[PDB]
Symmetry: D3
Subunit: 305 residues, 6 copies
């Protein structure tokens, strides 16, 4: 069974578009979802082969129910507020996601255009982000970001619903959250200190030896081992965004996993603490201003509506 373009090459542009369905607009959305497959290609085909245009369409809990005839993804729920001693992970409205990516921005902008064209009226926009990669895979804190993602079969294994919920095998669970960074603060740190916050070296992107790496460091609190005894894995594609004018500097978080337990556990760790840690040090510089969750169906699923 065939999934949407979750596993993409590195792509260096993206548009993240989040919307909510006015009541009334649920037949208009059924319609767009059937066609969304074919608009990917309308825009993408003439740009082969550099384009690498891909759209991942995800649906939120509330919206699922309004929209669909029968039974529900196992894992799907509203995103869960995390009300921690110090940091708060908020929970924002979000019925639909379009995760648009390609090797150039206009390709994304063309597809977003053609989509909202068919929705004008039936939805209301919540959030829109125009993302770009730094020329050597850095995020807004200046660290290489993407290094430890899974590949090949590991990724096919850690992202796609399989036999555990087999009416939607080929689906995935996306979490999104927009973060805004306190760059004045962050850049006030020594590099040595910043490594302590992330858990890897700034310039060479090597992992800090197991005994020099703080446990409040991001890489510590997100390395998390199952019942299974094996490592538990998500797939990210965090895109910097922002505005120099509005002093806005951001990293847009997106995290695919085969179940939301995995993503959600990493987030408890980050916002609430462990045995040995108050909260994730990175959040002392990064404020979450969105949060939603979505299921991103198989592609077979959408074509048939």
């Amino acid at each position: 069974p065939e999934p949407q373009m979750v596993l993409s090459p590195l792509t260096s542009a993206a548009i993240f578009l989040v919307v909510t369905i006015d009541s009334g607009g649920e037949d208009t959305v059924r319609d767009l979802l059937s066609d969304v497959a074919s608009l990917e290609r309308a825009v993408g085909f003439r740009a082969q082969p550099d384009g690498r245009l891909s759209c991942v369409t995800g649906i939120g809990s509330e919206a699922w129910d309004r929209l669909f005839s029968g039974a529900r993804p196992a894992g799907l729920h509203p995103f869960r507020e995390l009300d921690g001693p110090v940091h708060r992970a908020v929970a924002t409205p979000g019925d639909l996601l379009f995760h648009i990516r390609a090797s150039r921005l206009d390709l994304c902008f063309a597809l977003a255009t053609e989509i909202m064209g068919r929705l004008r009226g039936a939805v209301t926009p919540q959030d829109e982000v125009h993302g770009f990669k730094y020329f050597d895979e850095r995020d807004m804190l200046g660290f290489v970001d993407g290094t430890e993602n899974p590949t090949g079969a590991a990724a096919r294994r850690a992202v796609l619903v399989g036999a555990e919920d087999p009416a939607f095998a080929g689906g995935s669970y996306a979490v999104v959250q927009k973060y805004l960074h306190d760059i004045d603060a962050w850049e006030g740190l020594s590099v040595e200190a910043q490594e302590r916050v992330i858990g890897r070296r700034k310039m060479t992107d090597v992992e800090l030896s197991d005994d020099v790496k703080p446990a409040d460091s991001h890489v510590a609190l997100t390395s998390v081992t199952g019942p299974d005894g094996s490592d538990l894995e998500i797939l990210r594609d965090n895109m910097p965004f922002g505005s120099v004018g509005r002093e806005e500097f951001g990293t847009y978080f997106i995290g695919y996993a085969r179940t939301p337990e995995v993503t959600e556990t990493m987030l408890e760790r980050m916002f609430l603490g462990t045995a040995s840690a108050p909260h994730d040090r990175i959040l002392d510089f990064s404020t979450a201003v969105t949060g939603s969750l979505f299921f991103t169906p198989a592609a077979d699923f959408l074509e048939d509506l």
Copy 2:
């Protein structure tokens, strides 16, 4: 020549346009930054060569010029002329400084813009910030190829660079910016044949319409203007689309360099006020100017030294 700023740039695929005003007090901080701008271009740009083609061109407004330097003014430098037409209005908005930042990747623009606005925290107020992108086959937001008739080589040198006529500032140029917003609902209502009648070229093949077919109210008609000699009077453009899908904003950011503004301003008069032949440029029936500023972009020597 004196060595000029990177006005003659290749096709680049992304740009940031940053327009600011100088607060009271900020005079000093700005002079410091202008001396260093050259060198920030290189810091940020050098490690990504030659895939990169980062260029920053810095220009200065009329009012701002007087606050910053004493001595001679460039001959042509003035506030942008507001044009109150029968139908369409070309408006004048404030801007003391302009940064036209261009490269093949957006992040290179943004890294440079960060370093610049970083060093001007305190000293300015941002008026306009636009992130633009070329559509994949050099087309603009109306779906026509955009930049075809621009000059190159030495003809460009002749059209944009101040020379002997104001020798103090040889190597400089006069940049005019206007941010336009388009009414696409309306535009996509026309047949292609009609749209070509607005622009004056063929949509798909980008060939000029023949002299006997091309309407007098077409864009290409009203912006071809002939000199004293009857030789065509030319500018350099690098119009970039921008916008936002959520808030139905589809735009073309206009930018135009010339050796003297009398040229650029002529084209505007014809566009907004009309000739005997044409009421106004049909393109304005789909495009609304919401900014307007005039700037002088000095030779890079002039910044390197103070």
Copy 3:
């Protein structure tokens, strides 16, 4: 069971070479077919991985009988002439086909040279066509060409012979037609009208909605659904060619499928019509001057002689 390079990546250049077998060349041809796989590699290897050289070799009905004995592919027959009210699809000679593709012309030409080198004397050339990608995947009518072709495993299952004819699993059925356009006339239509002939938008390459799309449009007559409701798909890699000297502007058509009943259906609809369409409007501007049907065997069938 391993197949010939029918599913090739998007390539920008191609040679189409069609020949007939002289009497007493049968030997020399079998020798060549055993080696063709290996000449692909000789020539192609040194220009990897930009190269994307692929050669697909197919065989006509009458030629098959002269070369082998025993069981024949179920579907293999001479191309069916179509004598329609208006438009006629012709049948031309063709014992062998070489569909050679790459990213550079020289690679195609070097391969074609080494093949015709080994067959100089055994065959007679009937048709030789050098094609090229126009801009951004547009054909000679100026529309985007390839867009609704199947990809990935949908293509696997629509072009490759399987269980239904198990002796020849891994094979395919290519149909070729050389078409010429009366551009004269086509450039006489407004774009609105031209879209009405094709069934998609010229510039944005989006489908016309079913409420406006004429039933005499190309996209109309070439969408066919089966008894079981699912789409019947083929794979095309139409290549423009021509000569400006002789005002010859063409699109060379090629169509692979797991059975010709599919390709042939689409042709019947194009040339002869439905209830609600006289014939495909595209033929009012396009003239078929060849027609040939070939079977492209699994690669192990050729290696093993």
Copy 4:
């Protein structure tokens, strides 16, 4: 003042060569087209920047020149002088106009060719049309590297461009074209050692053979000429392979620009007729000229002015 045609184009990987005659009374339609050729280059080319590298060079024959303009003639311009050698014959074939169209993709050449011959349908007759491509690693059909010793940069400017010596037409050049067909069966019969003896360089490493050993009937031998000026006489070539495998046709399309034909013509004399110490260029024993034409390729502004 004067800007020349894109003769000094980079190495490009595809070309169309189109040669035509002017029909009776077609002179008008052609002048119209020559004024616009520059503009069609840009229409077609601009949207495919910067990969495209589309260039068209337009040249004009001797007899055609008189039909189209009088006024001054370029000093050197004459019909191609037929060379009836002891063994090998360099023939003269008809040709009033030449379009040497080059880019990185064939479709760009063909799209320009379409637009040109579109405007000339009726007024001309095509004599020769050739689609040429790069073979691997700048090799020709005989499998040797082809273009190595071409002059570059400003040395090219000096060798190809008409200057002060004929100042009316400064910026022009003299293109000679010949279409050659090869006898591959015969050529691939030679050992590589022997083939190198024909050409005068090493096949694989493309190094010159030493004075010690290079035959004087080798191609590189016969085409090295020193002037009275003691300096080497240099031309610029962009030899392009073409062919069809069906009709056993393997070719090199030859084209040679120089500031004067006396130069190109000399090399030909040596190739076809021989020296004191060599019968004819060994290359001709495998290559047959089936066309031959001479043209003048004016400065680009000269065509603008019609």
Copy 5:
């Protein structure tokens, strides 16, 4: 599956080969390194995607295996067998560990090598270090195309990866390495026709010589072997040239992966000792082996878990 190491690698243009021995009581420090090597691949490589193509393949010798792990041994693992032939000798040199580092640029190889040997300072002794580079058209030091007949896709899967036959170590492979030096003076003494007789393919066009005419002492002859399975017996090679013009050293570094060494070893027997119808592989008359070592390159999961 299990995940195997990066044995089936794309075309890469550069490589570092590192062979070391483990000192007294280095066993601990090495196990530490092996657990992390996968992740240093990614540290160094990830930020240079997708041009980089950086891959590191890590192998272990027979004696070294026993020091580091007990548990099962891989079926095939043994010290490299010296072959003391009639004429030519294949030597055995020491090697406990192997790093076969490949990418598109050398500096990426070197950066990875640095980070590895950084973590082993103290605990090993370098035996062999080689910086290799492909010629631009996949040629080796003898001037022939090298890699052509290597298997691809799942036929490579089938040839190289330990499978069911020893399921403990499925995903592993057997690398044999040998460093060769050439006497190029001697080699460049042959005509090309003769050189093709040594190799068994055409120099220029890289086509196999016909079964009629290919010598049985040619390299391609002696290294095509058929099994019991009727099937051809295949390995995977990634020969890289290296050398130094100062020290008149020109080399081909050989490396050969297979699912069992019985395969690789057979080819060597035929090369060095001869068959019924060949004294030795003609290629050895121009190539001298100066190293020789055998390694097992485990499944990648086997390293992660230490």
Copy 6:
């Protein structure tokens, strides 16, 4: 008049440095080679255009110049001036010829070097041979961006090329080479903040430190010189890392072209001996010069004769 050698060369990522001495009686063989070197550049380079970017610059030592030619000597040409400083010593090593060979790929350098040393077997003795490689983001072995503030375009012409001041040799330049070895263990001991204090720029963003904060014993400090008139005195560098992991050798090969050596020499005086401000350039505390040689690289015409 003059066309110069390929000194103003594009950014290239690979290089061979070859330094040799002329044996007794080899004067003949060398003159022959120098006449031909121009044309070996093109033999080897032409078939790889335009990716290849192969260039060779050939320079000649002071002692050697006298052996080879009679007539004028370049005004500036002399043996390298040894500098025995308080702490660090810049040494003089032997060198009659230099080949500074550069391309995008190393095989191209090596193929050309083969052809050169092929034609000199017997007539020279190799002193130094170095294979260099630029790291992916224009960084050197210390991990800083290297090349940033080099002059370009016309400013380079003005700073590197002999002109009217010695018009016999206009089109020439003066190359100085030094091979440096680093103590990396020591260097990677420093915090990044400290390392920036050695260099005078920011490691990660490669921005100059402001005039107030920049140490006057920093590298960038001691190598900014202004002339008598107060216009900045510039050279052109193309520092290339090299090394060997086995033999713990990690290096930067230095090369510096200028229109007169008295410029390059000045920078060195400041580096090795000090100003009042500075004991010596902090970079030498981590970098040891183990070669040193000076060469004149003629106009290219001069070799054609």
